[PDB]
Design a binder for this molecule. Structure first.
Ligand SMILES: [Zn+2]
Ligand SMILES: [Zn+2]
Ligand SMILES: [Zn+2]
Length: 773
């Protein structure tokens, strides 16, 4: 929804008491001066060459054309009051033969047209006098135009949410367009399908694509077309329920509609990846409302987000007697500090380094916010796993939590699916008619118009009730722009993994009425992914959290790590956290009991295992693999399991789909242990381990030739995530020469070598490598 029709055509102000409608130009202007020395009407009347004026319906005087009571002269520069008061022309009507100027000090009398307060004007578009000239110069022959007549780089500080929209807006468009072409380039042509039937009795299609790195996500939408000649032309939409993983390389989709699926036929399918504008629209719209709607975020948040100087404000509030939340672990001192500081200000950042209890700290905050009783607390993060991790912790506190997701993500199971709004509505025994309708619906996918109408009516009632009555609503950043949440307000908002969102993404939940906003994350960890290189270079890949940091806002840092053996945290702490991370567990706490595995350096549970075999490209696709390297990864995996580790306590991180896929196949084929044990060893790229941990982590670097690389190979931040998932042991497998083409990896290899932990030869008889860097 735009500005009201009575919005000042210059700065946006739309308080009916402060506006003046210009009869010739048919436009409204405000009685405030803003950036110039003189009001916005007066400045306009002068340059547009006008004099005739009508006041607003809801104004001190009502909807009336200003004119002299004597002669009806409508010239405002000639009008004025004589003292029980009369409006008269200075000459000759004020002349005693038949005084106060109406315009005085370059604007209208305050008690006929009110002057907007500083706040309103400080919130309006900051239009300069030199900008008025040019804008007013264009209206001359184009009364339609506005101020907008290689993309402009992101800034630290913004005059305006309007300037803000104008800078990020075109960045979002570059991303959306890029993404559309990307998605559309992905079409696969000669595809073989395996058909199946879920227990929910929906139709499922399995198929295998070339091996690619980009990624495909559960709940993504795929258009499956039959194009063979064993039958006729058929098209179906489905949503991804399986990506290639430890159970094999197949992608699986669940069809929306069961009906008419060509189950009998197998060859000649075409796979298209449906693009939707939704997330970009929601981003564009959040920019719009950030500019246009002054109730969408508080004055404080508004000025703070835009890089203005604001005096500190203490949020009034009753502190809990105890900061630790029921259901959750006792907080340490720095976490207690974070919770208490954060509750007492309108805006905060919290930095949660690996192993420091970011998630528990966020859940505890949310918990106290929810008990202050201001309606549902809004909680977001940029990714589905990070929302789910947060949802789960918050649930431990005993609060009513609703997890909201897209209708496309509905087929997806997670540990928190039982909390999903669509599942909760399904269990509403207070609503039998809705339940009956929902049964009917679960035979086809669809309903009759009279019933689909009824069902939508009831489903809306059911969604209002669970959403309005929740203590906490968890959803994705982009998901906060869901139409089911519009018409709701959220005064308290916590965004975790905010360091993974672009500014526009982050702002989507922000504009839903923020009065208190907490951004949690870690800018030394995962950042936003921006596919469009132009957009990237203009700044889009800088999260909101990062910009506020560079702007000089100090994040409260969580200080104690409880995950890692001290030897494992040393290097990331020294590199990313200026050696400030404190160890909450000892070396002794982090020696696995009866785990008889021989570390090269027995008291340092890490090593870099040198291999220098050749990388190759996948036989089907464009990703990389390393066969030498994979054999070694299995041997290590097998040693760890034989020494006492359990498959779910081990993770393998590699940047390439080629290597992931090869590793699963290789272990199933050549692993000496029972095949299923390997199936339970998670192999994936670094994204899938965010917020998660294992006892042991193996990295498989893959590349043996100098390269740009992807994931942890050329992003120090992803390397930081890779090095901090393990509690007990980290093993890196790879080729040092290929990797030392990197300041960081260079430092990592020097470090490991000084630590005597850069090694070669058979696992049974490891020697220190003689290479140097
Ligand atoms: Zn104005
Ligand atoms: Zn005019
Ligand atoms: Zn007159």
């Amino acid at each position: 929804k735009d500005l009201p029709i009575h919005a000042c055509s210059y700065c946006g102000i739309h308080d009916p008491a402060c506006v003046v409608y210009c009869n010739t130009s048919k436009k409204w202007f405000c009685n405030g001066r803003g950036n110039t020395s003189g009001s916005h009407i007066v400045n306009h009347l002068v340059r547009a060459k006008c004099k005739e004026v009508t006041l607003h319906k809801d104004g001190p005087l009502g909807e009336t054309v200003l004119e002299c009571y004597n002669c009806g002269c409508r010239n405002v520069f000639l009008l004025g009051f004589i003292p029980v008061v009369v409006l008269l022309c200075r000459q000759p009507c004020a002349s005693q033969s038949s005084w106060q100027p109406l315009i005085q000090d370059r604007c209208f009398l305050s008690w006929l047209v009110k002057i907007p307060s500083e706040q309103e004007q400080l919130r309006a578009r900051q239009i300069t006098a030199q900008q008025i000239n040019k804008l007013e110069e264009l209206w001359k022959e184009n009364p339609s135009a506005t101020l907008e007549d290689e993309p402009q780089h992101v800034l630290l500080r913004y005059e305006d949410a309007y300037q803000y929209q104008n800078i990020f807006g075109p960045l979002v468009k570059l991303e959306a367009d890029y993404d559309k072409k990307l998605k559309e380039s992905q079409t696969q042509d000669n595809i073989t399908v395996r058909w199946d039937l879920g227990l929910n009795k929906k139709r499922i299609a399995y198929f295998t694509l070339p091996k690619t790195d980009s990624r495909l996500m559960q709940g993504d939408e795929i258009c499956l077309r039959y194009k063979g000649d064993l039958a006729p032309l058929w098209k179906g939409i489905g949503h991804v329920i399986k990506v290639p993983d430890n159970y094999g390389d197949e992608i699986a989709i669940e069809l929306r509609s069961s009906v008419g699926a060509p189950v009998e036929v197998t060859h000649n399918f075409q796979v298209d990846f449906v693009w939707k504008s939704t997330s970009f629209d929601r981003m564009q719209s959040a920019l719009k409302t950030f500019a246009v709607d002054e109730t969408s975020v508080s004055g404080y948040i508004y000025h703070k987000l835009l890089g203005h100087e604001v005096e500190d404000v203490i949020i009034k509030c009753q502190l809990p007697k105890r900061f630790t939340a029921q259901g959750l672990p006792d907080l340490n001192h720095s976490q207690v500090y974070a919770v208490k500081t954060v509750l007492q200000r309108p805006l905060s950042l919290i930095q949660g380094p690996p192993g420091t209890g970011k998630t528990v700290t966020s859940a505890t905050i949310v918990y106290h916010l929810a008990r202050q009783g201001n309606g549902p607390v809004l909680v977001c993060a940029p990714s589905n796993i990070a929302v789910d991790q947060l949802t789960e912790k918050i649930h431990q506190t005993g609060l009513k939590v609703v997890r909201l997701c897209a209708k496309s993500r509905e087929a997806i199971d997670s540990p928190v699916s039982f909390l999903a709004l669509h599942n909760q509505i399904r269990n509403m025994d207070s609503m039998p008619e809705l339940q009956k309708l929902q049964q009917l619906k679960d035979e086809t996918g669809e309903l009759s118009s009279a019933d689909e109408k009824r069902y939508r009516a009831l489903k809306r009632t059911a969604e209002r009730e669970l959403l309005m009555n929740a203590d906490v609503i968890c959803c994705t950043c982009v998901g906060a722009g869901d139409p089911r949440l519009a018409k709701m307000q959220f005064r308290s908002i916590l965004i975790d993994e905010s360091t993974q969102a672009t500014e526009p993404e982050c702002m989507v939940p922000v504009v839903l009425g923020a009065k208190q906003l907490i951004l949690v994350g870690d800018h030394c960890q995962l950042g936003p992914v921006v596919m469009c290189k132009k957009a990237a270079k203009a700044g889009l890949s800088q999260s909101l959290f990062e910009r506020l940091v560079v702007l000089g806002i100090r994040p409260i840092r969580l200080q104690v790590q409880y995950r890692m053996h001290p030897a494992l945290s040393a290097f990331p702490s020294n590199i990313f956290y200026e050696g400030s991370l404190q160890n909450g567990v000892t070396a002794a706490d982090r020696v696995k009991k009866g785990f008889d595995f021989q570390w090269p350096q027995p008291d340092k549970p890490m090593f870099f295992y040198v291999t220098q075999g050749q990388e190759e490209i996948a036989s089907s696709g464009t990703s990389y693999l390393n066969r030498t390297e994979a054999a070694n990864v299995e041997k290590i995996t097998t040693k760890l399991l034989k020494a006492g580790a359990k498959p779910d306590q081990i993770g393998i991180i590699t940047p390439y789909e080629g290597q992931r896929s090869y590793l699963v196949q290789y272990m199933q084929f050549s692993g000496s242990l029972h095949t299923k044990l390997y199936q339970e060893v998670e192999i994936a790229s670094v994204d899938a381990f965010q917020g998660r941990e294992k006892d042991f982590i193996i990295l498989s670097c893959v590349r043996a030739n100098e390269h740009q690389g992807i994931g942890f190979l050329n992003d120090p931040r992803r390397l930081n995530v890779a090095l901090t998932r393990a509690r007990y042991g980290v093993i890196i497998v790879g080729n040092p020469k290929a990797l030392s083409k990197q300041p960081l990896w260079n430092h990592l290899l020097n470090y490991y070598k000084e630590q005597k932990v850069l090694v070669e030869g058979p696992l049974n008889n490891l020697r220190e490598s003689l290479m140097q860097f």
